[PDB]
Design a protein around this nucleic acid. Structure first.
Ligand SMILES: [Mg+2]
Ligand SMILES: [Mg+2]
Ligand SMILES: [Mg+2]
Ligand SMILES: [Mg+2]
Lengths: 213, 251, 226, 180, 457, 107, 40, 256, 190
RNA sequence: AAAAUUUUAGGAAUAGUUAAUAAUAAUUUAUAAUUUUGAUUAGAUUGUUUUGUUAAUGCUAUUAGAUGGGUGUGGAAAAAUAAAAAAAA
């Protein structure tokens, strides 16, 4: 927006400076890990946990915190939901999209995400695994989605998982997959104990961006 | 209610209370529900001022390789009826789905046909909408649609490529909401028109010997009502408006 | 929050209203949004005294010993139809009888046409589920000569309060596409003789005299003798 | 939001709710009974002090003879007295800035004091509640309605800033010769 | 006793200008910004941040008294380093504006001359990055769960992901003033000085620069001629100092401000404005020695043109004579509407000019004044559904309705327009509401709430 | 590099970091070994999840489903007590059998 | 509370409450009047 | 069950995301403790950073403390090399030859036209700076990285005569870059971090070798002790690997 | 009214004029100890309970109350009490963790005199600067692990001696000769 | 998230356990943590403006109220009789 081009412009015009001595690192502090509060808060690299009234020299970011969004199927106890889960890496500035995929694959802790091969895409357009972030103008503000193999097959009832509400889960598939790990047959402590949302939550029509009545 | 600051409550990995991500399914009617009122705005824009990638010629051709890094998001208008290379054809005859093109068909070009096209690999999509006849909107000379024969051979088509089962974002229609005026009502007073001398001004309000005919006497409703719509926070019709003004509800 | 009643004025609790805003007051419960509702209890409540002296059979009772005279069956059917309209007419009961399932016709519920209230629905399309009398009904709301831009699921289609009137003019075949009717301000140039506005944003109706009588005869202004 | 509602002492909207100004005292033989005007939350606990925002004052509901003043042949002044201590700055703060609520009996007090117009619940049952119709009201309104800017200026001085700067104090505050 | 940094000085001088008190600005100047310099070839850059930040050696810690070790974040410590980016030219500019504001020529001439000279002969200082604590920063969010522009199916709701309602007011499309080159800032400064001339003219004669409250609006004030002389001399001084360099920088804001001066102070009809702007752009295309291909007038300029036509046809409404309207002496609706028409043709021709609600408002008003009775049609076609609008529209339009043939049309059109206000989230203003109320005997349209009336009585 | 920053609040390890200095006492074998074993966690992990996605995915299933089982799911003042046995000692004999003593550390 | 008079729309149900708040147009009008007063 | 219910190390809020997001819309996962892992752990070091214009140009000459024969340093670095090559022989192009070991006291860009005037002047001012300073005994233990893990070096511990060094350096810094304007890659009012560069990855190499020296190699030597050394000799050098088996030396000063 | 005599009382409900509204808690109760165990077997190893126990904390006689007037508040201005402590480093067996012994003050108002007590803290020092026997400055901060809320802010006095001892490969300080006291007699010869 | 104040006449060891790594480890790494400056078990006991006596540093009272988890709702668990809190005209 405004900030992005204001700051970009500032950087560009600061690099074209003929006469500059350079900063004095005695006067340019880092950040603290020691501050009041229980929680550990991670901030921007231009921001600090103390009050610094003076504006620091624009620096170029050598690690860009990319976000990569996946579709996930959550078990909500009335059936399946499809919602969004982000992975966040720190990708070196000049890195190749191939290498970004690799970073992503190493940084997800959910067993339900990276199972098959996937392609990174911005606004639906696939990206070259061959080229740099520099060419595609990826600023960390950019919206980057992630498209799996079977994802265009989801409109069917096959690839989309089958919930024990409406479908048989058989001795075939009780020993395999999320179905196994879930423990459908109720135990005393009630099993993994997932989140539940009831049937009448959204009314008769499910959640939409457009008001349907 | 406002959205809260951060989630410190539940582990992130499990993600817990999350509004479901909305996905647009091309098999169903709902698809069109999203895409249609966009199209109309789009066409309206095309009727007034030029937009670059809207009008094009002789379809498009790309390799199998670069197919998905080029196509998705693409929207363009062609003169004739020719269906894209390598697409299985699905006719949309189902009435419900059709229904959403109502506004676009009555107050813009009449819709002759709708077509859902799916490729060999099934991973792409094309929404193909064939209009018949001239627009019911006026078209300007310097506008994009003025470069087309189908308007102003009376059939022409709109082609929209997209990926299936994606959120109603990455079909890109919102870049088109640029608003340009229809200059038709003022074209009458331009130096170009010869009916500009048949115009005569009303500078002064005419002398009034009458009052407005009093409205029909009020019949108080006979049935049972749900109570004050004010206190129930119902907008005046349950339709539109502010809950402070209770006009037009039962009283 | 968004749209209060009389701004914030807190001088009583009831001073606020029966809801604070149209929007859901907790974000975790969406359905609490302010709608316009209908008395479901009374308007379902179908009369079982029309079903007296009948002998209805059942769906899966097909047996030879089970069923009865064709005359008996006929009067049973008539008593069942009489059972279903026993309050008012459901939309899918109106629409199945009209040509083309009543596409294009204007469905108004009773209370929408009386008092200063003026509203109806131009039906876009209909789905009958296996059962009639239930289903999904889509259309364009028209409120005081103002019309919707796109179709919407018609709410409370299943509650039997509905009336409509069959006009051949409005009928549309399943081939074509139901057009949204014109909103009288914009697409059709406004005219007084064809359409006059019942009530407008700052207007409200004058006092009916007998209500006033009742209220004064209540508060004890106008006396009342047994 | 309690599973088993505490049945006897219900309230609106959960805890602790709005700040409200209440009148309360421990119950005793009527001869000695006093009340407290207290700003506090909507949901009280066992002891009223846990949620207590401020202490607005003592109120004694016993008409008193004024022995403090010298016995006065003026008729009015020898009516009995009713004694109340208001803290008016915390009142105007809590009510004005913090937007309080009000129970009814405190309202009646604050009315006798000229802080608030008399309550909703004070009824001379002599008069009835009024009637209304829009077009008569409208005739009266068309008859008298002030000018736009006069009214805007009213709303300005009442709600927004009151103290303003007339020409003279401007002229008095602007720097003189060596820096002018 | 906090030493104001340069930024602060700017802010306070902005308040000084708007207040037009030179006295404040002089004391403020004299105390704090005196020794403020410019940047020269020898001078270096943003100066680095030189402060230590404050610590204690163990002997400082142990042997000092308690107060010596007490650090509250105190300005005056970082003042030196808040000023490391050299915003001085801004201060000089504001100071010019003030000396002009308080009506003193010599001082103004001084500041503006210094500024001009330094702007031509000294390097452009490196601008400061956006301050984290004022303008914040764009934290990352996916925009996925959002209200999906067509949400309510009665209208177009704006949305966080994209803006579908079109701009309510035209924006100049220039970066923040500090990012400019030195030459560019010189230009900017002239436009600034003009803007202040205008503002001062509106503080002197508030009646004449309000649209159509008084017939006084139609005739030049004495002392306006001297003013315009000043403006002309100024602009010609800009073309005299800056040479061919002007061919390389944005004149858009400058032009729009000149046009707005010759629309407001001296009063020029729309045709005169369009002419002036074209002659100006000719001048700027010619001074640069090239093949021409002039830049077209950008959206803001056209906004000034159109409001020019709107000034042209304007009416004092409901004189106490119960006479309909008073008009600009020597007004021809035909010619006016002719020029407006071919001007809108001109605009809508050019693809790069964005339309806003205000431009449409100037147009609509020009219609209403001209007795065109097409105002409705234009409004409903080009505005109503597609913009977030004022009730100013409905004001001009009610004036239009009033002039129709029969009464029922008046009533019904007006009522319908109120329904417009209720549907389209325009909170019909008190001006409009009063304009409707005035005719109550004729049209019988109630404007007030029930509540509002009761309470009122 | 021996002093902390008073206004910044950063420790001496910090200002030493910034002046690009290292005050680090000579290390014995314990510390060198622990540290050297810690540095490499990410190489080891990277190699693991690239070369052997299955074993990884099994273990992840464990963690994920585990989060939903167990004592607390919610992280509130109770769950989020850094010292559970200490702040609730009044649970320790009867209700809570996990802990035999109220104090395992300095405080 | 919200006053439910006897001439409100009676609900016939054995599974729930005996009287739904729904109004005779008279009661609605009346309510509007009293409300106006309180607005004052 | 083996510890705290929510381990304190796992409690992390990301404020660089957004106010509403993580409550409702989506949840963001990351391994957040790679980023938090600190300057001591990674082995990073903050060197005086160059202004952009100076950042563009290559350095030409540098100041160096010359290491004598028979060092503890050179010996132990040789042992370190052997160990490293036996572990991974991919290091082989990274490693600096034990013959080229020197301490880097600061780095500098000299233009080729004014070359003679500047070497003369520098050498003179340098000789004046160190006239009073007697030899320096410095301690070397620990490793650290410059340039994002591309340059791997031995630290100079401020436990010894180092103090004097810092004054000494900070004098030439204010002469060489302050007095006669010369490009020191940093600001002359700031002090350079003295170091012994052990392994390095140059721009040309970076394609076959990789973008960062993997920390698995030098992890175990990260805190290793290379010992004490006394230094009497200061050099100003132009960078050529060829001429002596050592860097081509344009000037010298003896500390005595 | 607490100032009125036993026989002077009239109403128990109110204070007629002013003063303090007091509740008489009955201080003299003859409260007693119950003896539930034989003197031979008491169900505790260390300490035995034979009489009524005095039950307060700070209600507890003779009163010992928090004194924030010692050296630490003398040198520092603390935002919150205990946000700063000066101490000696005792032991580093835990990576990046310096244990610190620190004195604070208690006041006995009965005897009008002070005592210093001592307390241990875990301080987080990134980077392991501290050696045993350093005089350090220590601050309150973010909860770091279960027991560490303090971090090493500054070394006032390093251990020059101890560091040199380390460089040579020996421990910073010799390990204490005897451990904790015992109730046994350990006969271990040669 | 912490800091200070903590009882028993005759006094010994305590333990899902410390610290680093990290959204790891029912077998990660380490010379680990609490204690005689009185720990942990066990006894008694409702914690840091409330009383009584007294000229007075003292002595002698102060109620009551937060008792784990197991589809985790809710802004917050305080959620299973025991009000004396007007709870959407
Ligand atoms: Mg709120
Ligand atoms: Mg603790
Ligand atoms: Mg116990
Ligand atoms: Mg339980």
């Amino acid at each position: 927006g405004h900030y992005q081009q204001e700051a970009f412009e500032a950087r560009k015009r600061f690099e074209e400076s003929t006469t500059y001595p350079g900063p004095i690192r005695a006067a340019t502090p880092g950040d603290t890990r020691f501050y009041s509060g229980s929680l550990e808060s991670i901030l921007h690299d231009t921001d600090r946990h103390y009050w610094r009234a003076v504006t620091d020299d624009p620096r170029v970011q050598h690690l860009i915190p990319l976000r990569i969004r996946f579709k996930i199927f959550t078990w909500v106890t009335s059936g399946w939901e499809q919602r969004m889960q982000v992975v966040q890496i720190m990708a070196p500035k000049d890195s190749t999209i191939a290498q970004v995929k690799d970073l992503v694959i190493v940084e997800n802790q959910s067993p339900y995400l990276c199972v098959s091969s996937f392609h990174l895409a911005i606004d639906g357009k696939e990206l070259d695994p061959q080229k740099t972030l520099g060419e595609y103008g990826i600023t960390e503000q950019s919206q980057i989605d992630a498209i799996e193999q079977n994802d265009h097959l989801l409109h069917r009832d096959d690839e989309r998982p089958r919930d024990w509400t409406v479908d048989e889960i058989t001795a075939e598939d009780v020993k395999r997959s999320p179905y196994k790990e879930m423990e459908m047959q109720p135990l005393q402590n009630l099993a993994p104990r997932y989140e539940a949302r009831p049937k009448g939550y959204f009314g008769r029509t499910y959640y939409s961006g457009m008001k349907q009545s | 209610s406002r959205r809260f600051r951060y989630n410190t409550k539940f582990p992130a990995l499990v993600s817990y209370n999350k509004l479901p991500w909305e996905v647009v399914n091309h098999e169903t009617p709902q698809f069109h529900m999203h895409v249609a009122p966009h199209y109309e705005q789009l066409l309206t824009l095309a009727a007034s001022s030029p937009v670059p990638h809207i009008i094009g010629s002789k379809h498009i051709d790309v390799p199998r390789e670069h197919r998905l890094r080029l196509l998705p998001g693409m929207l363009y208008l062609l003169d004739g009826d020719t269906l894209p290379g390598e697409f299985t054809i699905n006719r949309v005859l189902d009435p419900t789905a059709l229904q959403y093109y109502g506004r676009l068909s009555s107050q813009i070009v009449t819709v002759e046909a709708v077509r859902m096209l799916v490729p060999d690999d099934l991973r792409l999509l094309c929404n193909c909408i064939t209009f018949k006849g001239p627009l019911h909107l006026p078209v300007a000379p310097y506008a994009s649609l003025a470069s087309l024969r189908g308007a102003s051979s009376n059939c022409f088509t709109l082609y929209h490529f997209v990926r299936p089962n994606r959120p109603p974002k990455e079909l890109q229609l919102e870049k088109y909401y640029i608003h340009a005026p229809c200059v038709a009502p003022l074209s009458e007073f331009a130096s170009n028109s010869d009916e500009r001398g048949n115009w005569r001004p009303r500078l002064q309000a005419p002398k009034r010997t009458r009052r407005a005919t009093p409205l029909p006497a009020y019949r108080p409703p006979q049935s049972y009502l749900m109570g004050l719509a004010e206190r129930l926070a119902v907008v005046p019709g349950g339709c539109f408006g502010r809950r402070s003004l209770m006009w037009g509800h039962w009283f | 929050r968004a749209d209060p009643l009389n701004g914030g004025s807190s001088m009583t609790l009831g001073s606020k209203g029966s809801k604070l805003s149209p929007e859901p007051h907790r974000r975790r419960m969406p359905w609490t949004a302010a709608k316009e509702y209908v008395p479901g209890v009374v308007l379902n409540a179908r009369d079982k005294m029309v079903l007296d002296g009948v002998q209805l059979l059942d769906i899966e009772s097909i047996d030879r010993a089970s069923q009865l005279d064709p005359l008996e069956v006929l009067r049973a059917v008539v008593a069942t139809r009489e059972y279903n309209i026993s309050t008012g007419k459901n939309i899918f009961q109106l629409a199945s009888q009209a040509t083309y399932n009543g596409r294009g016709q204007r469905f108004y519920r009773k209370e929408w046409q009386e008092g200063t209230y003026d509203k109806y629905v131009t039906l876009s399309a209909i789905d009958f589920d296996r059962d009639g009398n239930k289903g999904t009904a889509y259309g364009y709301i028209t409120f005081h000569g103002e019309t919707t831009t796109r179709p919407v699921q018609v709410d409370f289609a299943d509650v039997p309060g509905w009336y409509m009137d069959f006009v051949e003019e409005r009928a549309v075949p399943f081939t074509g596409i139901v057009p949204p009717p014109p909103s009288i301000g914009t697409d059709v140039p406004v005219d007084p003789h064809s359409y006059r506005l019942k009530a407008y944003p700052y207007y409200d109706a004058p006092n009916p005299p007998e209500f006033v009588e009742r209220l004064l005869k209540d508060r004890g202004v106008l006396p009342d003798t047994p | 939001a309690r599973a088993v509602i505490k049945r006897r002492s219900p309230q609106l909207w959960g805890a602790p709710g709005a700040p409200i100004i209440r009148m309360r005292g421990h119950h005793v033989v009527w001869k000695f009974q006093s009340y407290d005007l207290v700003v506090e939350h909507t949901h009280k606990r066992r002891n009223s002090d846990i949620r207590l925002l401020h202490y607005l004052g003592k109120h004694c509901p016993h008409p008193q003879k004024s022995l403090w003043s010298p016995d006065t042949p003026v008729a009015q002044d020898r009516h009995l007295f009713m004694l109340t201590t208001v803290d008016i700055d915390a009142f105007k703060y809590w009510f004005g800035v913090k937007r309080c609520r009000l129970s009814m009996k405190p309202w009646a007090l604050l009315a006798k004091a000229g802080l608030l117009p008399p309550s909703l619940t004070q009824n001379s049952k002599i008069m009835p509640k009024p009637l209304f119709d829009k077009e008569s009201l409208m005739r009266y309104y068309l008859a008298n309605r002030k000018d736009e800017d006069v009214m805007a200026r009213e709303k300005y001085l009442n709600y927004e800033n009151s103290m303003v700067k007339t020409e003279e104090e401007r002229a008095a505050e602007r720097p003189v010769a060596p820096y002018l | 006793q906090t030493w104001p940094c340069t930024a602060t000085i700017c802010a306070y001088l902005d308040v000084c200008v708007e207040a037009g008190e030179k006295t404040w600005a002089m004391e403020a100047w004299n105390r704090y910004c005196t020794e403020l310099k410019f940047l020269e070839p020898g001078e270096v850059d943003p100066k680095p941040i030189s402060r230590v930040p404050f610590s204690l050696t163990r002997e400082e810690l142990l042997y000092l008294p308690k107060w010596k070790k007490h650090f509250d974040h105190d300005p005056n410590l970082d003042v030196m380093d808040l000023n490391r980016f050299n915003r001085t030219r801004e201060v000089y500019l504001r100071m010019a504006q003030v000396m002009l504001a308080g009506g003193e020529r010599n001082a103004f001439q001084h500041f503006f001359t210094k500024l001009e000279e330094a702007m031509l002969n000294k390097p452009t200082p490196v601008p400061e990055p956006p301050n984290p604590h004022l303008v914040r920063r764009p934290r990352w969010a996916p925009y996925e769960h959002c209200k999906s522009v067509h949400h309510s199916p009665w209208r177009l709701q704006n949305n966080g992901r994209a803006l579908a309602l079109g701009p309510p007011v035209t924006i100049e499309d220039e970066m923040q003033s500090r990012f400019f080159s030195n030459d560019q800032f010189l230009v900017h400064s002239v436009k600034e000085v003009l803007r202040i001339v205008l503002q001062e003219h509106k503080r002197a004669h508030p009646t004449e620069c309000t649209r159509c409250k008084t017939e006084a609006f139609f005739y030049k004030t004495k002392d306006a001629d001297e003013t315009l002389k000043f403006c002309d001399d100024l602009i010609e001084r800009l073309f005299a100092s800056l040479g061919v360099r002007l061919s390389n920088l944005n004149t858009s804001s400058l032009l729009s401000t000149i046009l707005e001066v010759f629309r407001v102070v001296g009063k020029e009809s729309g045709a005169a404005l369009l002419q002036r702007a074209n002659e100006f752009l000719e001048r700027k295309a010619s001074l640069g020695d090239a093949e021409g291909s002039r830049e077209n007038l950008t959206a803001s300029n056209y906004l000034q043109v159109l409001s020019g036509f709107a000034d042209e046809s304007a009416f004092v409404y409901n004189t106490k004579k119960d006479g309909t309207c008073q008009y600009k002496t020597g007004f021809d609706p035909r010619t006016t509407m002719r020029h407006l028409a071919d001007v809108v043709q001109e605009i809508a021709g050019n693809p790069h000019v964005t339309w806003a609600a205000d431009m449409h408002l100037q147009v609509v008003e020009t219609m209403v004044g001209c007795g065109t009775m097409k105002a409705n049609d234009y409004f409903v076609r080009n505005v109503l559904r597609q913009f977030s609008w004022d009730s100013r529209f409905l004001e001009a339009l009610y004036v239009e309705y009033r002039r129709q043939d029969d009464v029922d049309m008046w009533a019904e059109l007006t009522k319908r327009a109120l329904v417009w206000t209720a549907r389209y989230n325009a909170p019909a203003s008190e001006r409009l509401r009063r304009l409707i109320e005035d005719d109550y005997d004729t049209i019988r349209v109630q404007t007030r709430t029930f509540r509002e009336l009761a309470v009122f009585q | 590099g021996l002093n902390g920053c008073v206004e910044t609040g950063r420790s001496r390890s910090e200002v030493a970091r910034d002046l690009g200095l290292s005050y680090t006492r000579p290390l014995h074998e314990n510390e060198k070994k622990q540290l050297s074993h810690q540095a490499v966690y990410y190489e080891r992990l990277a190699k693991f999840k690239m070369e052997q996605p299955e074993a990884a995915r099994a273990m992840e299933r464990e963690r994920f489903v585990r989060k939903f089982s167990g004592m607390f799911v919610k992280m509130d003042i109770r769950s989020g007590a850094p010292d559970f046995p200490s702040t609730y000692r009044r649970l320790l004999g009867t209700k809570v059998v996990r802990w035999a003593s109220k104090r395992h550390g300095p405080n | 509370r919200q006053i439910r008079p006897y001439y409100n729309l009676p609900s016939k149900s054995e599974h729930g409450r005996k009287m739904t708040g729904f109004l005779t147009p008279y009661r609605h009008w009346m309510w509007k009047q009293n409300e106006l007063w309180r607005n004052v | 069950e083996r510890g705290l219910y929510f381990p304190i190390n796992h409690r992390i809020v990301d404020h660089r995301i957004a106010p509403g997001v993580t409550v409702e819309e989506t949840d963001v996962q990351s391994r957040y403790r790679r980023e938090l892992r600190t300057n001591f752990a990674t082995g990073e070091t903050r060197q005086t950073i160059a202004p952009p214009w100076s950042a563009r140009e290559r350095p030409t000459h540098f100041f160096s403390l010359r290491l004598p024969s028979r060092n503890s340093v050179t010996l132990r670095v040789k042992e370190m090399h052997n160990h490293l090559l036996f572990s991974h022989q991919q290091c082989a192009p990274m490693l600096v030859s034990p013959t080229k070991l020197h301490i880097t006291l600061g780095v500098m860009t000299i233009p080729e036209n004014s070359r003679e005037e500047l070497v003369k002047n520098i050498q003179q001012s340098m000789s004046e700076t160190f006239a009073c300073v007697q030899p320096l005994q410095l301690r070397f233990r620990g490793l650290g990285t410059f340039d994002f893990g591309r340059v791997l070096f031995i630290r100079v511990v401020p436990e010894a005569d180092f103090g004097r060094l810092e004054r000494a350096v900070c004098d030439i810094r204010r002469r060489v870059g302050g007095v006669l304007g010369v490009d020191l890659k940093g600001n002359p009012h700031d002090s350079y971090v003295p170091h012994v560069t052990v392994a390095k990855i140059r721009p040309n190499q970076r394609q076959q070798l990789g973008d960062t020296i993997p920390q698995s190699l030098w992890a175990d030597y990260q805190h290793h002790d290379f010992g004490d050394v006394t230094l009497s000799t200061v050099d100003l050098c132009r960078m050529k690997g060829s001429p002596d088996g050592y860097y081509h030396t344009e000037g010298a000063v003896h500390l005595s | 009214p607490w100032w009125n005599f036993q026989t002077e009382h009239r109403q128990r409900c109110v204070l007629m004029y002013g003063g303090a509204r007091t509740k008489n808690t009955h201080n003299a109760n003859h409260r007693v100890f119950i003896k539930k165990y034989k003197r031979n077997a008491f169900p505790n190893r260390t300490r035995h309970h034979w009489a009524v126990s005095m039950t307060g904390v700070l209600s507890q006689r003779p009163r010992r109350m928090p004194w924030p007037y010692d050296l630490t508040s003398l040198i520092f201005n603390q935002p919150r009490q205990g946000s700063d402590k000066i101490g000696y480093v005792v032991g580093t067996s835990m990576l990046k963790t310096a244990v610190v012994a620190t004195n604070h003050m208690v006041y006995y108002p009965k005897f009008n005199q002070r005592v210093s007590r001592t307390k241990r803290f875990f301080a987080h020092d990134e980077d392991l600067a501290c050696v045993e026997g350093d005089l350090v400055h220590i601050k309150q901060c973010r909860k770091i692990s279960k027991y560490k809320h303090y971090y090493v802010f500054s070394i006032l006095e390093p251990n020059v001696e101890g560091r040199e001892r380390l460089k040579l490969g020996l421990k910073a300080v010799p390990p204490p000769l005897f451990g904790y006291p015992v109730s046994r007699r350990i006969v271990k010869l040669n």
